[PDB]
Structure formats: C-alpha cells, structure tokens
Structure 1
Amino acid sequence: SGPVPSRARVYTDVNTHRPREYWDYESHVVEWGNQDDYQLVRKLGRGKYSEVFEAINITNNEKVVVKILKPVKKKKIKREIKILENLRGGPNIITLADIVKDPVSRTPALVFEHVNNTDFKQLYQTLTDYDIRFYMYEILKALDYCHSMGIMHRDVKPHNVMIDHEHRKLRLIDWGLAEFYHPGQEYNVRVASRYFKGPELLVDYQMYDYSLDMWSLGCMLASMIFRKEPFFHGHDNYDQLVRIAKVLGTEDLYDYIDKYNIELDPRFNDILGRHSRKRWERFVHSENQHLVSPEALDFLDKLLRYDHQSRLTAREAMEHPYFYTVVKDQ
C-alpha cells in the first residue's frame, strides 16, 4: 500500500539483457598495473572517499591524475572500477588509464588521463551565450552515452565537469557514486551534492533512474544562464526542497508526491508554506540578459520538472532548438 513503482522511460532493460559479468561488479577481478610507473607531483584535493594527486607517468613523461581510494563500504571500489572500464572510450567520459596498488595506503589507486581545467567559479563568469550552449551539448553527449550503457552518474555538478577551455574540450569525472540501473530496484537517496539533489532524493523516493542526472544538469544550466551560484541555495536537505518549491511552486510538488503515493516527512508541515510557480523571467536582469533566450528558458523548463518521468531525456535534450546555433563536430 506504499509508494507507486516507477521505471525509466528509456534504456529500461539494457542491463537485464547483458551477461551477469557486465553489471555484477562484486565478482569483477581487478587487473593491476605497475605503481612504479607513476610519480606523484602535486596534491590536488581530498574528498571523504579519496585523495587526488597530479602525477607523471614516468614512462611516457605524460601528465596523469591519481585517485587513491579508501571506503568503508569497500564494494564501492569494484563498482567504480567496473563502471569506468565499461564506459571507457565513450564521448567525453574520463579515461581510466591504469589501476595500481598504492604502497602507502595499501588500497587501489585509479590513474586517469590528464585535463587542463579552469576553476568553474572563474570560468562560469566568462562563458558567452555560445560557449554555454557548446559545453552543455558536450555534457549531454557524456550523459546519453552512460545512460545508454545502463549507468547513472548521480553526482553531476560543476566540480565534476573538467573543462580545458583553451582546446574547448570537456570530461565528466568522479564516477564514485555511479550505479547500474535495474528496473524496480530501490536506491540510496543519499547521493549527489546538496544544491544538485533531485526532488526524488529530497522526498525519499528510492525507485529513481537516469532522470536524476537531468535535474542536476538543469541546476547547472540555471546557475550559468542566470549567473546565480547555486541556483537553489538550501541550508540543508530540507531547506533545499523549500528553495525549489519557492520557484516551481508547492501545488506541483503535492501533485508529484500524490502521483507516486509518497508522504512528505512531517518536518515539512511548518516550513514548506504555499508558493506559486514563478515564470522564469523573474530571474532575468541586465547583467544576465545576454545569456537568456526563449530557447534557453524553454530547455531549462523541461529539465527542471518535479516529476522525474516528465524531464527531457539526454537524447531528447540534444534535439532541442537551444542547440541549433551550435556547430557540431564534425
């Protein structure tokens, strides 16, 4: 008598038709390379799950990136590895170049191709209207590819899109939260970063799919065209849904949760309020108007839907008039 089930409207059964080995990552046997090939140069960052270093492959003198892991849910290791191997060579997907055992941590270190990135806080202040469209199309190539392979990223955000602006090149990175989509499976709602979490996550609906990534992409688009970082600025996961409802309105939120027979956390009773849907022109002003067009707003509107089933798919998104002005290569 609980929630109504949901299925992806595209690529629904891709994994069910595959051999066990494609998606059964627990059974994957890791192929190890030689750690002596790599010399660490510069620490680039630390997450809760890993440390990331710039390095050099001493054999070819080529720059490289080393991610040294250590989870508590150790099955994440084989999941990330199998996903990266499955997706290797896809459009705009970061390439896993090697897997080595780190002598100090005694855990797997993932070795990736290098990308000469510019800081998004810096880059998202320079992007022209043309450049926003161009780079959005490139991200879509990556998302359609992984969705078609039966994989959802689940952590789409500006930090995970590495851009070499000089060569106009883009890579979707950090597949540590990525998962195989199986119809009917319930998933953990504690994925994605706060500002990019889809309404399905925020209302604790577990039977979600590829469409989660399209919400996240919509948040990125809104932040770029409106020059507002982040677009939905929640203090916590609960306030995050309130911020969304202040733009999309509460009546469509209740319509969404009623469709799937979901009950909001009663915590919302005294914080959600009653809000109308805003027209997107509300967010336009003299400083962002050169980035806004009727095409931009229409495309945005079709990504940022409460109902995960109603959002544009990656392939449909690439069909949108927003991308008509973009020169396609080649």
Structure 2
Amino acid sequence: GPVPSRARVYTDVNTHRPREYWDYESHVVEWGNQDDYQLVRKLGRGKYSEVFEAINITNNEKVVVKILKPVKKKKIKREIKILENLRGGPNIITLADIVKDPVSRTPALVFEHVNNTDFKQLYQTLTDYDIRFYMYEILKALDYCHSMGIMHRDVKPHNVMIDHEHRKLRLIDWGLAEFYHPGQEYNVRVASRYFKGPELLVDYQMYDYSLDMWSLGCMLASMIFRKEPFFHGHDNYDQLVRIAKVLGTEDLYDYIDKYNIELDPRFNDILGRHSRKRWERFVHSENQHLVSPEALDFLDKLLRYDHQSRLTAREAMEHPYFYTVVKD
C-alpha cells in the first residue's frame, strides 16, 4: 500500500480544537433575513453556485450574494463552517450573513463586497513590485487558514479577488476547502486542472496544506513568466507530463517511489524521459523585468513534486523575494 504522510506543520490543530470546530455535519446554521438583500446583477455562474451583486437595504451597502446550487448538505455546511471559523482572518473573504433563498430553496451566502479589478487587466499590468506585494497578501491568507486547520484546495487566479485601487486582496470560494486531519484520505478531484498538485495527479490521497503551495507556485510562474496558465495540460494526464517536462522525470520517479505510489500505466507511452530544467530557460525580453534571482529561488522552492518538501506559507513569508515589499 501507499506510504503514509503527515503535514510538517499545524498537524494537530483540529485534534486539540473542540469537536464543534471541525465537526461541520453537526453545525446549526443561523439564518438572517432574506428580505434584507436585493439582487442587482448576476456576476457569474460556477459549477456550484450563482453569484450576484446585491444591496443590503439595511445599510444601502453593496454585498455579494452567492446562491448555492443543490449539493449535499454536508458540502454546504462544510463551506459555511469553514467561513465562520476563518472570519476576520487576514485577507479571508468575510461572510456577513446566510439566508434561505425562496426560489432556489438553497442557502444564499452573503459576503462583503470587493470592487475587484478584473483579472485580465490585472495580470497584464501588475509590476514586479505588485506581484511581490500581492503574493505576500495571499500568503497571509494561506498561513491563516492552514494555522486554523483548513486547506483551501482551489487556489487559482479567479479565486483571488483584488481591488487594485485600494491594494486590497481577498481569497474567495471556500466551497472545496477541507479540515486537515492527520492520516485522513481526501478526494483528489479538487482544484482546477492547471493548479492541481502532483499528489492529485498521481492519485495520492493523504495530502495536506502543502497542496495550496503548489497551486500558489503555479500562479507565481504564470505571473513572472507571463504565461497563463503555466502548466497548460489538455487533460489530467497531459497535465503531469507538462510538469515532468520542466521538473524532470527522474525526480517524479523519486517522488512516487518515496510514497510507494504507482503511475497509471497509461503514462507508459506518453510520459517519456525528461531532464530537470533550469528556470532561466523561461526568461525572455518580455518578462525579464518580473524575474529576479530571488523570484526564481522562491518559485523553485514552491514547485516541488514532494509535497513534504515545499515551503510552508510561513516559510514562504520569510523568503528574500519579499524583502523589498514594504511591511505594514
């Protein structure tokens, strides 16, 4: 069988929390007044929700209303409990209210409004300094949720809302987030394809917070190299091949051998043999202003096959890449 794995940090946070903290199945939802919120315009529709701009008519302030699609009460209660546990934490989207939508017959989550700069304008204009600044802000959110026994499991650009005018960042959509329990096996069908960690792609279920750090690395690579997404697989198998063409196949085999994992035999005729590449290979005249020795070393230390080898969020915040960022 597969060799077991443990997070190297925050391993026992939920063990020593009261049961009510992580036992979300027993959570009792406290419902607000549905008539407090007037929907204004539909912002989007995801796999699991529809999102609206709304007005809270008790303060005439803008809010965001997320009307959940019908899914298991436990996935719904999981997201609600996680949002309540993390509320007030650094750069965590703030759940303001929960109401029963009378049309959908499902919960509608009410969030603080973030006047986000749309993401294409963002990624084509962010400066070297901007990238460092916002990466640090994401790390605050991730260290917070990891320290609170929670992994996000869907870190990607669309879940990082940035109001560039006020230099304000919020990590959103905690619908895939889970509580970390040592030894627990998790669903590997999480995260967007391009941001899936190698653990997911080789079906290793005993993963942890470090999954989010791979996803973060993929975001960083896309920003400093101006290639979005960075690892652009056509499916989940090709996704691992794309990663292997960069990190090399010998270290992939070291990884799966360490945990006594076997690759899907369908890799036998698509994987090939690949050397590990130096990150300088991806530098060119159109991205070089975003690249520094510090950026490349930081990236290098996020994108490891071995989830146990990646920087933690706290270690990442110590990295020289952030020395130039003004600390508040």
Aligned residues of 2:8 and 2:308 also touching (Cα < 8 A): yes
Alpha-carbon distance between aligned partners in 2 of 1:16 and 1:102, rounded to the nearest angstrom: 35
- Normalising by the residue count of structure 1, what TM-score does the alignment of the two structures yield? 0.99
Using the aligned pairs only, state the percent identity. Answer: 100
| Equivalent residue number for residue 121 of structure 2 | 122
Deviation of 1:23 after TM superposition, in Å, equals 0.3
Instruction: Give the secondary structure class of the aligned counterpart of 1:51.
Output: strand
Deviation of 1:33 after TM superposition, in Å, equals 0.2
Alpha-carbon distance between aligned partners in 2 of 1:177 and 1:187, rounded to the nearest angstrom: 11
Alpha-carbon distance between aligned partners in 2 of 1:70 and 1:236, rounded to the nearest angstrom: 26
Aligned residues of 2:11 and 2:182 also touching (Cα < 8 A): yes
Q: Is the aligned partner of 1:108 residue 2:98?
A: no
- Structure 1, residues 249-308: CA drift from partner, whole Å, max 9, x if none? 000000000000000010100000000001000000000000000000000000000000
- Structure 1, residues 169-198: CA drift from partner, whole Å, max 9, x if none? 000000000000000000000000000000
Alpha-carbon distance between aligned partners in 2 of 1:147 and 1:195, rounded to the nearest angstrom: 22
Residue ranges of structure 2 left out of the alignment (5+ in a row): none
Alpha-carbon distance between aligned partners in 2 of 1:271 and 1:289, rounded to the nearest angstrom: 32
Deviation of 1:118 after TM superposition, in Å, equals 1.3
Deviation of 1:131 after TM superposition, in Å, equals 0.4
Aligned residues of 2:97 and 2:111 also touching (Cα < 8 A): yes
Assess, with a 3 A threshold, how the Cα gap between structure 1 residues 71 and 105 changes in structure 2: closer, same or farther: closer
- Structure 1, residues 112-149: CA drift from partner, whole Å, max 9, x if none? 00001112122111011000000000000000000000
Alpha-carbon distance between aligned partners in 2 of 1:140 and 1:48, rounded to the nearest angstrom: 26
Alpha-carbon distance between aligned partners in 2 of 1:38 and 1:93, rounded to the nearest angstrom: 22
Aligned residues of 2:233 and 2:239 also touching (Cα < 8 A): yes
Alpha-carbon distance between aligned partners in 1 of 2:145 and 2:237, rounded to the nearest angstrom: 30
Deviation of 1:80 after TM superposition, in Å, equals 0.2
Deviation of 1:204 after TM superposition, in Å, equals 0.1
- Normalising by the residue count of structure 2, what TM-score does the alignment of the two structures yield? 0.99
Q: Residues 281-320 of structure 1 correspond to what in structure 2 (within 5 A)?
A: 281-320=280-319
Alpha-carbon distance between aligned partners in 1 of 2:249 and 2:120, rounded to the nearest angstrom: 31
Segment of structure 1 superposing worse, 64-73 or 293-302? 64-73
Q: How many residues align?
A: 328
Runs ≥4 in structure 1, deviation > 3 angstroms? none
Aligned residues of 2:34 and 2:100 also touching (Cα < 8 A): yes
Deviation of 1:18 after TM superposition, in Å, equals 1.1
Aligned residues of 2:38 and 2:54 also touching (Cα < 8 A): yes
- Structure 1, residues 52-83: CA drift from partner, whole Å, max 9, x if none? 00000011010000000123333100000000
Q: Residues 56-71 of structure 1 correspond to what in structure 2 (within 5 A)?
A: 56-71=55-70
| Equivalent residue number for residue 196 of structure 2 | 197
- Structure 1, residues 65-114: CA drift from partner, whole Å, max 9, x if none? 00001233331000000000000000000000000000101110000000
Alpha-carbon distance between aligned partners in 2 of 1:177 and 1:199, rounded to the nearest angstrom: 18
Instruction: Give the secondary structure class of the aligned counterpart of 1:16.
Output: helix
Segment of structure 1 superposing worse, 45-54 or 306-315? 45-54
- Structure 1, residues 223-271: CA drift from partner, whole Å, max 9, x if none? 0000000000000000000000010000000000000000001010000
Instruction: Give the secondary structure class of the aligned counterpart of 1:15.
Output: helix
| Equivalent residue number for residue 251 of structure 1 | 250
Aligned residues of 2:70 and 2:106 also touching (Cα < 8 A): no
Alpha-carbon distance between aligned partners in 1 of 2:173 and 2:128, rounded to the nearest angstrom: 27
Alpha-carbon distance between aligned partners in 1 of 2:255 and 2:317, rounded to the nearest angstrom: 26
Alpha-carbon distance between aligned partners in 1 of 2:168 and 2:51, rounded to the nearest angstrom: 21
